[PDB]
Design a binder for this molecule. Structure first.
Ligand SMILES: O=C(Nc1ccc2c(c1)-c1ccccc1S2(=O)=O)N1CCC(F)(F)CC1
Ligand SMILES: O=C(Nc1ccc2c(c1)-c1ccccc1S2(=O)=O)N1CCC(F)(F)CC1
Lengths: 546, 546
């Protein structure tokens, strides 16, 4: 029985195959059939190509050797190469045109999810071309999803040499009958088969996947849309910045490009952005996913005043100061969304662009205090329950697993009454002791929040709600201002704390405001609709944020 | 007696003054004298400009109000503004042309060095222009060098209102007689003087500095070339990446732009790059200063094999994998320099560009083992002393302060014989118990290395020398290759371990190699000649590394 799946790169995990471009060039240039392909494999195991694939020479050293082989091949066929013939130009284009074979990757991802050990086994070169980065990016995106990457130029061995197959077997710690091997070259498939491995000749993807699913007994074709790539906390780059003597800010960092600062809500973590971090980094951005003040590995001072908007925003500016960032795109959800609008109002020079998920921008009423404005419009009754220090902390910290299981639920899973909290005397009074697991989270993901919240508890997080009067007074200084930097407002149809209708007047204060809307989405936007969030954010970032 | 220096921004710390461009535009456009300047201050404390400087409105909201004032002013003077007149265009240009007043900053830096509390007090706006980043960058570079930055638009107060002066005094925790205040506007100087502060009207910088030095009794003018900005370890962003179960890599991170990975030598730290980190980040790069495996906050496994080049390079690739970086510019010194040439040979797709300080690239001799090649060319006798596990560790760890004080010395400070180590039986036998402090280091900088080396000691660092045969065998696989990506070789005239002559044949293996040379520079390149290093690296990075 199979427990390992091995995939080739060219013609298998990446399409169109770079090899097949030699034939395309022959047809386009009206050269004799197989001429370029013959010059490519000239000398067989002793030839320039084998030396390149073994890593004896780099791609740039190989280019003139292929050109020499091309001349010798044309000479025998009694023909001539065109005036502007360039091997570099042909391969630059072929490599650049080659993209991931998404359904093949999805199949590999499903097999690994079902307990398979996956590997990429490829005949490749040491790319030292001025344009090598495009390929470096392709390999990076691909490799992360597999247990192993065996490259011919790294191991000094090549397909179809039997050595590489024995090396693959040993890397896999598996006997050949436990291995399914997928390749587009029949010759490279032969030694794996001769060893006893299940082999698949890959021409079209669909047939190869039908063969793969028949042989593994796992559904891989026509299967539902998978969730975006998530984050394994121990495989992340963890950053720590001291913003003042008693305050340190923790963040997770992934990618290169314009800095994108992700700001979570209550009672969350940097981990609430797990489905956005890999997607945003893949889209060409440097993601900085925060543990906001009071949370996870960030400092949680006890004082209420340490959590007013003025202090939080000032510390985020200091955070940018110490990291050497003149700007960052600020993306917030919930209380993070509120922080991001205030960063745009008070520090526009430090905010490249501003985006909020669910949290609208509503200017302060200079006549009514928010301690009295609650309750007026809807019922923010739970906010009144959050005011008295120690009360909500006691209920929220009693059983952490129950707290996150009860709170982190989709719109059609509510076990919590949004309001009547200060009548019933608690958020969890009509809730079970052992809540069911929401379809949005695994048991493992709940236990990450449990472990995170064991360090500082709910005092710091609840203190974000305890500066109503302080925040209002500070917000009143910004009343004559408008947000004129690029801005995105993303509403969630079924968020009952933050109803889309609350955002309707925003264009009066942010005239050039751009929008997004997610249907059948509750309060926990990022984990409820990750695919939609990523497409709305990536589209807006590529259009409005460098 | 003075203990605090306060500087204005426009016309004082930054030149040319943005205010003086209104007059320049009047002259260029042949408009009535003072017209634009009058429209700018129209309404005095009730006018658009005061509201802007108090932070009631943003710069973009102000632009059309200034345009309206410009029309009203021209109407009274019975004149007309030109067809293509644009306030935004005028200010965009004025702000962009404004640069730091370097000698004024150097004076502020010298005063802070001599125990002064320094501050910037400025009348500024909330910049929400599409080009706001240029100003954000200016403020970032400037602010880091001062204890305080008081901005009118942040404090809701403006110069010359007496409130701001009382606010400044309170921020400073100082009585007005202890304060020297520098400004280009006589009116804004008046309330500070009326309070009892020493005031300086700044027209030309030189006179202002003569006045400043006479009043402080500190030499500020004609003073020597200062050292580049260094790093305070506690004000840095510290990053941690787990590359494998037992290995975590620590790094310091500063800046935005192309990733520049700094790799130290033996027995060093990320801190060996203290003078390069702020300079390189200022030059438009994202600096990642490593604690190499075996050092500081990075893991130090005991096994010798954990330190062979193959493993170290593979882990640096994994480091890039986990941070989401397809490439980084690799800059190494000493053993770090050796690592960087091997990264370029084995992983060219992951190396944007390669630079080495002192360490040359010399291909392996496939006939002679390096355990026998030592000694042949010079005398690498100390390397033989480093071989036996536990011996060099005992001497190097006995007294840490003595170790770093003895090793970290300029060319004309040697208390150490480079060789005859394995005859005399130790690196420190003819060295004092209490070495003098080298002119290259302060006592505080030595104590940072002491504290760093208290965690893991010298086992891991010395293990870099204990894989001679392993490294040679791996290097022999690269013998047919050439380094064809952008490369820089920087030689140090007085490095006696790495003599410039050792690098002479490099062009045979790196044909397009670029060079740098530092005269009167010993082995500790970065701290010996920081200014020269920064100019050679910045020049090469801007030319060859995106
Ligand atoms: O209080 C919030 N959100 C918010 C976040 C998390 C939870 C609730 C509300 C809530 C409300 C009622 C019961 C349980 C819970 S809960 O613990 O699941 N907001 C006010 C400030 C803001 F506008 F910035 C963002 C929205
Ligand atoms: O050993 C080195 N450098 C090096 C680094 C640090 C010290 C010495 C040598 C040395 C030599 C003799 C006495 C004291 C000392 S010391 O402890 O001050 N190199 C060989 C490998 C390389 F080529 F990669 C870089 C250069």
């Amino acid at each position: 029985t199979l427990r390992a799946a091995v995939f080739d790169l060219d013609g298998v995990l990446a399409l169109p195959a770079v090899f097949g471009v030699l034939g395309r060039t022959e047809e386009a240039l009206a050269l004799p059939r197989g001429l370029l392909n013959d010059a490519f494999q000239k000398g067989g195991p002793e030839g320039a190509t084998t030396r390149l694939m073994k890593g004896e020479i780099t791609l740039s050293q190989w280019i003139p050797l292929m050109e020499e082989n091309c001349r010798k091949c044309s000479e025998t066929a009694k023909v001539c190469l065109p005036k502007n013939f360039s091997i570099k130009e042909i391969f630059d284009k072929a490599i650049s045109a080659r993209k991931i074979n998404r359904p093949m990757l999805q199949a590999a991802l499903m097999l690994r999810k079902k307990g398979f050990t996956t590997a990429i086994l490829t005949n490749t070169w040491l790319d030292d071309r001025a344009e090598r980065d495009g390929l470096a990016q392709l390999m990076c995106e691909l490799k992360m999803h597999f247990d192993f990457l065996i490259e011919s130029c790294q191991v000094g061995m090549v397909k179809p040499e039997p050595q590489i197959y024995k090396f693959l077997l040993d890397t896999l710690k598996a006997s050949p009958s436990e291995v399914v091997f997928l390749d587009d070259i029949g010759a490279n498939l032969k030694p794996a088969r001769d060893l006893g491995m299940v082999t698949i000749l890959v021409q079209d993807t669909d047939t190869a996947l039908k063969e793969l699913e028949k042989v593994t007994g796992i559904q891989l074709l026509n299967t539902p849309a998978p969730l975006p790539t998530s984050c394994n906390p121990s495989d992340m780059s963890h950053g720590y910045v001291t913003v003042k003597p008693r305050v340190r800010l923790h963040f997770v960092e992934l990618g290169s490009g314009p800095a994108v600062c992700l700001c979570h809500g209550f009672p969350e973590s940097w981990y609430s952005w797990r489905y956005q971090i890999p997607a945003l980094a893949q889209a060409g951005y440097r993601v900085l996913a925060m543990d906001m003040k009071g949370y996870g590995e960030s400092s949680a001072p006890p004082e209420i005043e340490e959590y007013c908007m003025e202090v939080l925003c000032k510390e985020m500016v200091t955070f940018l100061d110490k990291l050497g960032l003149s700007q960052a795109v600020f993306i917030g959800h919930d209380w993070g969304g509120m922080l991001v609008w205030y960063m745009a109002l008070f520090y526009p020079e430090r905010v490249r662009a501003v985006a909020s998920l669910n949290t609208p921008f509503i200017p302060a009423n200079p006549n009514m205090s928010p301690l009295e404005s609650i309750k007026a419009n809807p019922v923010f009754d739970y906010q009144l329950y959050f005011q008295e220090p120690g009360v909500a902390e006691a209920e929220l910290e009693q059983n952490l697993s129950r707290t996150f299981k009860s709170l982190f639920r989709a719109s059609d899973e509510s076990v919590l009454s949004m309001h009547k909290v200060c009548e019933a005397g608690g958020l969890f009074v009509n809730s079970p002791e052992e809540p069911s697991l929401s379809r949005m989270v695994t048991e493992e993901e709940i236990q990450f929040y449990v472990q995170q919240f064991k360090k500082s508890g709910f005092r710091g997080p609840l203190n974000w709600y305890r500066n109503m009067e302080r925040n209002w007074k500070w917000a009143c200084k910004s009343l004559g201002r408008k947000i004129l930097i690029p801005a995105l407002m993303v509403t969630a149809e079924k968020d009952f704390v933050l109803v889309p209708q609350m955002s309707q007047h925003m264009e009066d204060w942010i005239p050039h405001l751009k929008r997004g809307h997610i249907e059948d989405c509750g309060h926990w936007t990022q984990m409820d609709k990750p695919t939609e969030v990523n497409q709305i954010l990536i589209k807006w970032l590529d259009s409005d944020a460098r």
